[PDB]
Amino acid sequence: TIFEERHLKYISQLGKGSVELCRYDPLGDNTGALVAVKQLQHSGPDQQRDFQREIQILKALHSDFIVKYRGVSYLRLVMEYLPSGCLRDFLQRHRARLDASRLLLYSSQICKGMEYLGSRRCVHRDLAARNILVESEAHVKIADFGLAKLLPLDKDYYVVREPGQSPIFWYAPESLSDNIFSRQSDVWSFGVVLYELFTYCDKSCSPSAEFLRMMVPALSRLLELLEEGQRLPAPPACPAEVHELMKLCWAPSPQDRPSFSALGPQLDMLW
Numbered sequence: 535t536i537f538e539e540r541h542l543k544y545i546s547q548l549g550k551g552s553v554e555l556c557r558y559d560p561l562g563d564n565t566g567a568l569v570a571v572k573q574l575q576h577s578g579p580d581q582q583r584d585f586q587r588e589i590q591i592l593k594a595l596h597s598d599f600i601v602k603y604r605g606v607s608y609l610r611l612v613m614e615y616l617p618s619g620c621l622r623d624f625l626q627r628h629r630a631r632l633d634a635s636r637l638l639l640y641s642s643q644i645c646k647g648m649e650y651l652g653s654r655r656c657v658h659r660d661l662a663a664r665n666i667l668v669e670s671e672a673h674v675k676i677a678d679f680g681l682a683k684l685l686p687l688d689k690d691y692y693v694v695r696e697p698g699q700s701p702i703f704w705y706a707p708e709s710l711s712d713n714i715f716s717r718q719s720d721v722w723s724f725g726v727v728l729y730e731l732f733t734y735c736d737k738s739c740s741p742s743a744e745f746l747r748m749m750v751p752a753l754s755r756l757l758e759l760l761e762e763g764q765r766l767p768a769p770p771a772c773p774a775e776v777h778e779l780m781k782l783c784w785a786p787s788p789q790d791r792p793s794f795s796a797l798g799p800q801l802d803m804l805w
């Protein structure tokens with residue numbers, strides 16, 4: 535649970551702070567285990583405080599569908615390494631091999647991870663295929679908890695001061711208009727993840743490419759589009775039942791969206 539800095543050997547960059555692939559090699563002979571290590575590159579007590587908040591959240595999550603916390607190095611967050619990487623690239627790389635049943639299995643696993651996060655009063659805020667990791671051909675896990683927040687016991691939503699820095703195409707209308715985040719805005723984002731799964735993350739029909747094609751500031755143009763009732767089109771060859779669940783996740787009002795507890799059994803039935 536406590537990793538000595540001197541024994542964490544740098545291998546390569548895994549992506550964005552930053553996540554590096556390291557070998558925890560106390561024997562110094564290149565035989566030690568591989569770990570994914572996150573660290574900040576910018577000071578400031580706020581980014582440092584935000585980082586400490588993320589570590590406390592992840593350490594307290596225990597689920598087969600959430601990336602495993604391993605420990606800290608005093609500074610660095612150590613997690614399990616998943617060499618298959620993000621679901622977005624995996625889907626692009628394996629499109630000709632994964633069928634609808636497999637996509638439904640991933641959808642069900644993400645939904646179960648989200649149901650659990652909601653039970654912990656945790657709002658993820660950045661659910662997207664690029665933030666989901668692949669453990670194996672038949673198992674995915676939610677990762678990237680850097681924007682996650684815990685809801686106080688007496689309030690089921692949070693208001694952020696500054697608008698998001700993430701690509702705008704995953705945000706719920708209330709997040710775009712009023713910077714409001716909740717477990718219900720995570721359901722909206724999950725509807726975008728179902729879309730990503732069913733397009734195999736094809737860049738030509740991606741949430742950014744398609745919304746920009748359908749689309750004055752861009753944020754305001756997208757908010758206008760959504761408020762009119764316009765939505766992303768059903769992915770090519772998408773099962774009708776799956777497209778109907780996406781539309782429910784995209785209900786204009788947060789209270790009308792199904793909960794992850796309601797979504798789970800429906801995804802399992804389709805699978």
Ligand SMILES: *CCC(=O)N1CC[C@H]2CCN(c3ncnc4[nH]ccc34)[C@H]2C1
Nearest residue numbers: 548549550553570613614615616619620
């Ligand atoms: C889509 C590219 C990709 O594979 N990723 C995005 C950049 C980082 C973020 C976290 N991460 C990662 N990769 C593998 N094992 C990990 N364990 C914790 C975080 C991990 C990359 C995934």
